[PDB]
Design a protein around this nucleic acid. Structure first.
Ligand SMILES: [Mg+2]
Ligand SMILES: [Mg+2]
Ligand SMILES: [Mg+2]
Ligand SMILES: [Mg+2]
Ligand SMILES: [Mg+2]
Ligand SMILES: [Mg+2]
Ligand SMILES: [Mg+2]
Length: 224
RNA sequence: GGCUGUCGUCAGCUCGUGUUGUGAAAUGUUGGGUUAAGUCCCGCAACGAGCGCAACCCUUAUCCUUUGUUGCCAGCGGUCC
């Protein structure tokens, strides 16, 4: 990753001056047109060492999950995870899915049974009414937790989009002592994240840049 | 003990795990619509489940098939009708 490629995607952009969190005053260079400018000369070493640690953990054989739930950012997250042989969540984060795994992991078995009944020819016999409920059940259990169906246990790292919009997952992971790599704007709380990567996180270009970089480094680490 | 009346055939009453609070407790069960209904859809630090609601039970209203006595008489023969 290079500084010019970062500035080309709008990473320099931040948020307004009246919405800034003073916990990351150090990661701000200046302000123009009543908008903060992120000191990206801090961003480059952070991003590089974060990628190094991510691919090291990939070589350490630790499954990972990609967390992004924005309405205009789901496809990038799901594709970056899918073409990485890893896991993803792109809808509402079902609260407690980590700390309360014992009661959500059977929703996985329910989804699997429903999908076998779907693509096995079972949805023909019954009296043409409950198939509607079954189809909606497939739809909802696919949208909610259909991206971790083959998770098979707790993860070993988490990648987070919009630390503000995704703080419940951050607390859930912090409970379990699992490292978190998150993207933070200038209105974010960097307390729960041990590997902090500053940068704009409302533009599609920067988000897909980060996702491509992390997918590439994870494939590198698996190539070991 | 067993059995019964009533609020009231009113739509309510709880639990496991998770989270919040020093704590009694809270969330779930709140919010927008909608229904006879905690009935259903959407959103949601909650995810699921149980007793209730509804369905399964009896009878009535339409048609179909089988059997015709002690029940019936449309088409034929006789009549004490
Ligand atoms: Mg406590
Ligand atoms: Mg109640
Ligand atoms: Mg309550
Ligand atoms: Mg409430
Ligand atoms: Mg309501
Ligand atoms: Mg109910
Ligand atoms: Mg009933």
């Amino acid at each position: 990753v290079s500084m010019r490629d970062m500035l080309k995607a709008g990473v320099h952009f931040g948020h307004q001056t009246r919405y800034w969190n003073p916990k990351m005053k150090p990661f701000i260079f200046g302000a123009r047109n009543k908008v903060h400018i992120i000191n990206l000369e801090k961003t480059v070493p952070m991003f590089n060492e974060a990628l190094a640690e991510l691919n090291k953990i990939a070589s350490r054989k630790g499954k990972i999950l990609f967390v992004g739930t924005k309405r205009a950012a789901s496809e990038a997250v799901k594709d970056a995870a899918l073409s990485c042989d890893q896991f993803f969540v792109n809808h509402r984060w079902l609260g407690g899915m980590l700390t309360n795994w014992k009661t959500v992991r059977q929703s996985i078995k329910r989804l699997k049974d429903l999908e076998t009944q779907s693509q096995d020819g079972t949805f023909e016999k019954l009296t043409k009414k409950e198939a509607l409920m079954r189809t909606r059940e497939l739809e909802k259990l696919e949208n909610s937790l259909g991206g971790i169906k083959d998770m098979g246990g707790l993860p070993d790292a988490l990648f987070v989009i919009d630390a503000d919009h995704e703080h419940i997952a951050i607390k859930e992971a912090n409970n379990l002592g699992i490292p978190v790599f998150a993207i933070v704007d200038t209105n974010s709380d960097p307390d729960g994240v041990d590997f902090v990567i500053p940068g704009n996180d409302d533009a599609i270009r920067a988000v897909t840049l980060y996702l491509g970089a992390v997918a590439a480094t994870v494939r590198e680490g698996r190539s070991q």
